[PDB]
Structure formats: structure tokens, C-alpha cells
Amino acid sequence: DCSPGIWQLDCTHLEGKVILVAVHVASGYIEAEVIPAETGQETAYFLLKLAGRWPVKTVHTDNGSNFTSTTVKAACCWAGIKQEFQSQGVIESMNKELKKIIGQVRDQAEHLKTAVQMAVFIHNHKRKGGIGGYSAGERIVDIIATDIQTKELQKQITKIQNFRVYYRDSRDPVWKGPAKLLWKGEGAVVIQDNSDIKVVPRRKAKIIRDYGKQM
Amino acid sequence: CSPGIWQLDCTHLEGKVILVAVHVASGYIEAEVIPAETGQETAYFLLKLAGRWPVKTVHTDNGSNFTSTTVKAACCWAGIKQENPQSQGVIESMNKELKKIIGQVRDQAEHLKTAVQMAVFIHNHKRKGGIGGYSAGERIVDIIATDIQTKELQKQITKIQNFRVYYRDSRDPVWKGPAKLLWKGEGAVVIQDNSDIKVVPRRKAKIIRDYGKQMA
């Protein structure tokens, strides 16, 4: 539930211009930008560009100083992103391997930035030599879109949760208490119990008009 | 294929020229204000765009950045390829749409370049379709999803397409004409000749690739 919407960004201290890298921590997607001059404000316009390609719920910050800039914090509010208080070192090292391929292309491009963007293209559209069903370069907007189906799902889940159906086991003075209902059918209605299990006929089952909680 | 192509038109505003990178199918746009405008400059944003997503192709009947042979070469390192009446009208309108949006964002923002950037998160966010949302910005993660699912399956389809199986039919009648199997189930297999949707028991047939088990 936590992994979604989460993005980790690493600053790069580099020959020539400084640069910073942005990845959904799970996705592995990379959109690094070469930094002409470093200001949190400067950091922000890109972070602003970063949101359109993908939404980020929040970003943890490597640097308290990139954190200190008022604009940098200012951006977290427009976004609604909250600044959050070995392997990532290996990810920067992967950026270094990327820098090595960037070295392989260093001859190819005078502009270090080009190399970095290429390196980004390199993390992207990348397939493991070990067989992988899913490419990490093929980070899935979809697994973020499944939950997107999930939000609508929970939404459907909430309306069912909103309805309470009450039933009576047959020939029972007692009337069975409210519980989430597993299914609705014209022939039969299925119900769910916690610390108990039950299912029911549709006639014992009843139909309710929608009562909505917290608009 | 429609997802692969991206279509780009850029118009200068207040002198400074914004770079614009619409994906038509998505309807998503990524635009970057360029410190300086050149074809090479045009090239860099595309490289960034390539990092966010693959593009099969883009079309310009001609562009100045496009004329610069340099812009093409990049699309190639990329593997993207340089190149609907109701749609043809909309594209200029979309370019225009952000600007009307920009005038509002302007009263909002001190710096136009940032502002244009601002217009987009919103542009994606608004949904044209319903009270339920079918925003083009919304559409893209699914669109990406659809194509994604297609490939893993298509490959299954290819691996499958190659694998083939004979049918006995009546035993005495010549056993078969091998047809590509539609499916496998225990004690049976779904197969079709390209003449008729067929089904049969496990015993009736064995299944190595017709042109079989090529290490490949």
C-alpha cells in the first residue's frame, strides 16, 4: 500500500555541471536532469516537470540543504507531496555503470548531459540478461493503474460496504446481525461473517436505498 | 502502434519559444521551455521524452529543428521514426488550449516557463469524458498497460503460433492436417485448422513445434 506514489531522488556531484535523478522507488523509471546551477527553486521546476510524466505522492530527500530551500518545501505543498525525513548507493553506482556506458558514449557526446539522459534511456527500455517476465525498465504505470482500477474497485467496495443487509436464519426468533455480503443474486444472496461464516437465499435477503457516509 | 507515435508542433510565445511534446494517443503532452532553441536542442527534450516512454514515430512534413539532420539521428538512436479529420482540427486547438490556460496561469505565476509546466499537470488531470473519469491524462497509464499486456501475450502467441499439432479425426481416414493449437487442457487440447475451430483428447495427438524445437 506504501510503495505506490513514492519517488526517491539522488543529487549527483559530477565533473562539470551537478545533476539530480528522480525514480519512483519501485518503478526504477529514471528522469534525471542535469543541473545548470543548484537552488531548491531550480530543483523545483524540474520536480514540477517530473509530476506530469508521473504523479508522486511524496519524495524522501537525500540532502537537508536541498530540503532547506523554502521553494523546495513550497513545492511539496502545491504537489501535496510531503518531504519525507547500500542498494540506492548501488543505484547511484548503477548510474555510475550508466556513467561507464556514458563513458562508452563519452566519446560519442561532448555534452555530459546528453550522456546522462541517454543513461536514463538506458535504465529505460532495458531487459535483464537473466530471463525476466517483466522488465524493470518496463516499470509498470499499470501496476499503478491496477491500483487505479483498485481505487475504483474500493469505490465499488465502499458502496457495498455502505449497504447493510440483515437476514433471519429460517425459523429463528433471533434475526441475524449486519455483516458484509459476499454476493447479490435474484436467485440467492451471499454473505460474509468475521469470526463466523454464513451465506443466504435472496428472499431472506432484502434491498436497501443508498445511505451515504461523510459525503 | 497508435501508442507508439507522438506528434509535435511548437509555437514561440512572448518571443521565448516553448518546446512541446504531445503523445497523440495518450493526449498527454510534455513541453519544456528551452534556454535556447535549436534542432539539437529539440533533440535533447526528445531524448528525455524517450526516457519516460518509447515512441515508435513522430511526423513533421518539415521542421527547422527537423531540417537539422541532427534531430533525425537522435530519433534513430531512439528507434523512433521521423515522418482523422476531426482530429486534424483538434491538434492546433490543443496547442491553443494550453495558452488560454496559460493566460489564467499567468495571473497566477511570476515566471511563464514554470507556468506552462504548471498548465500540464492540470491538463492531464482534467477529464473530458464523464463524472466518472476518461481524461486523456488518465487514459495513458492504461493505454500503456494495454500495449504492455499485448506484448507478453503476443509473444505467448508467437511461441504458441509456432508450436503445432496433428489430428487423427477418424483413425482410418488419413489422420490429419496439423493445425496450430488454440489451447491445452488435461486429456485434451483446443486446436483449429484455419478452416474450423476444433477440439480433441490428449491421446489423439502429440505437440512439438510443427517446425519443431528449433533451439532458436
Ligand SMILES: Cc1nc2ccccc2c(-c2ccc3c(c2)CCCO3)c1[C@H](OC(C)(C)C)C(=O)O
Ligand atoms: C552536439 C551534438 N551534435 C550532433 C550533431 C549531429 C548529430 C548528432 C549530434 C548530437 C547527438 C544527438 C543525439 C544523440 C547523440 C548525439 C548521442 C546518442 C543519443 O542521441 C549532439 C549531442 O548534443 C545534443 C544532445 C545537445 C544535440 C552530443 O552531445 O553529442
Ligand SMILES: Cc1nc2ccccc2c(-c2ccc3c(c2)CCCO3)c1[C@H](OC(C)(C)C)C(=O)O
Ligand atoms: C521566482 C520564484 N520565487 C519564489 C520565491 C518564494 C517562493 C516561491 C517562488 C517561486 C515559485 C516556486 C514554486 C512554484 C511557484 C512559484 C508557482 C506555483 C508552482 O510552484 C518562484 C518561481 O520561480 C521559479 C520556478 C524559477 C522558482 C516563479 O516563477 O514565481
